[PDB]
């Protein structure tokens, strides 16, 4: 006998929002500001994925 196990894909969504002044201060202070933001969200999401799993 062959049965099936199915489910829809569900979504997760995060946002940050960094002002231009903050991005400028991050660059001045040695941080890669555009990558910093992406790492923040990507890391936070990946962590939340691990929590979910």
């Amino acid at each position: 006998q062959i049965n099936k196990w199915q489910t829809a894909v569900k979504s997760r969504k995060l946002k940050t929002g960094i002002t231009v002044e903050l991005a400028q201060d991050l660059e001045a202070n040695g941080f890669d500001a555009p990558n910093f933001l992406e790492d923040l969200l990507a890391t936070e999401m990946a962590d939340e994925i691990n929590k979910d799993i």
């Binding site: 400028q24 201060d25 001045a28 202070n29």
Partner: protein, 52 residues
């Protein structure tokens, strides 16, 4: 415009920068009330400090 021909610029590469300055100071303690500046342009030298 008058441009900036009448002032310094020293553009920043970081917000909120700072400027230091050096004063030559005499009287055995560079940081003390009454200590004097050795090369001050208005005030004369202590002409006998190293002498009599």
């Amino acid at each position: 415009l008058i441009a900036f021909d009448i002032c310094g610029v020293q553009p920043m590469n970081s917000p909120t920068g700072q400027v230091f300055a050096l004063r030559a100071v005499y009287g055995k303690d560079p940081v003390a009330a009454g200590a004097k500046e050795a090369f001050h342009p208005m005030y004369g030298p202590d002409a006998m400090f190293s002498g009599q």
